[PDB]
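Aim 2, interim progress: modelling of the zinc ion-bound target.
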Amino acid sequence: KISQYACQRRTTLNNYNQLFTDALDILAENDELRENEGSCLAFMRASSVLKSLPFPITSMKDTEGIPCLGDKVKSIIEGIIEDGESSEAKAVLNDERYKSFKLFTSVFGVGLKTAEKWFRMGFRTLSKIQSDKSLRFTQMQKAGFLYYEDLVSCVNRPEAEAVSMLVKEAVVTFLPDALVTMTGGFRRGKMTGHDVDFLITSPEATEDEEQQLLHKVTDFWKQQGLLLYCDILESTFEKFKQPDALDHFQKCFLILKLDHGRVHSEKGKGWKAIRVDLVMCPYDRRAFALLGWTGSRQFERDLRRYATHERKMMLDNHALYDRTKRVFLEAESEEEIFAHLGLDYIEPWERNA
Ligand SMILES: Nc1ccn([C@H]2C[C@H](O)[C@@H](COP(=O)(O)OP(=O)(O)OP(=O)(O)O)O2)c(=O)n1
Ligand SMILES: [Zn+2]
Ligand SMILES: [Zn+2]
Ligand SMILES: [Zn+2]
Ligand SMILES: [Zn+2]
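Predicted structure of the complex, ligand included:
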């Protein structure tokens, strides 16, 4: 019996149902853009469960016993079985609002509000937005437009590893005992990503040393002429608060200049702009941060839902709290968090939910 929770399923990059999941992912994305959170969630859960299957769906009988497959989702599956296409997903791909929202939000610094504003002003292309003399852009959007082609090109593993070298080199200059771990999609085994994420922690650094590292590292890169964009969010983390966007570790959203000579791959300007996110956490919370920043987004949503609805526990990126025992549960590894929750350990490459 397949569980309704992604944290109780093994989801590897071996997807046998991409014909169904690509359609469900488009319908979920459109519902996100149309601010229909409920319908978005239903399509995301259905797409997630199909991604976990060890076989391709070839008839409606194959869907019997599979959870998170409502009547609307089953109608979409039935239509794809019929002629290999989703008429619903095809209509979304051709919708002018969907196309504009995908195109505008593909710019670093442009969210739902700005995309909607530009669409209602009558804009349909990035060329017409960029050349407009009345529009005002944020510093994030300026960088988003200036390095657009590099940021819309996917980051591959040789590039991610070249970025890892730069991060490690900079960090150990100021904190030589620091541990730097690549998180996100690349930690789950992905060949490509939109950015490169890292978790930084130090077993001996003080509260102030921990605070100053991201400032020292980014100033070093600014001096080297490698810092193309930088936004540092100070920590809002509270050591003794109970475990959605307001509480967080110190982090920074960057754009780094990656020289081609640093990339060791089999293969213009001689450099590429790369989106990099750095997260600094206290040493004792490193397992919770690692689990949260490894993802996938759906795996994280189901982990938190399972903890709350099944084990009356409260989980987030900073801690695990037991509401029955009225105590915070400690962990030195992800394995210990899974054991506290009563879950079999799911490897990072099996969290592609
Ligand atoms: N406020 C935030 C930001 C990020 N994350 C985590 C969970 C995600 O898996 C990942 C989200 O940022 P990304 O979209 O870069 O993660 P990926 O590396 O998985 O995305 P992609 O492969 O699409 O580049 O890190 C989080 O928990 N909370
Ligand atoms: Zn990423
Ligand atoms: Zn990121
Ligand atoms: Zn928290
Ligand atoms: Zn080489």
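Residues 184, 195, 197, 277 surround zinc ion (ligand 3) (CB under 6 Å). DSSP finds 15 helices and ten strands in the chain.
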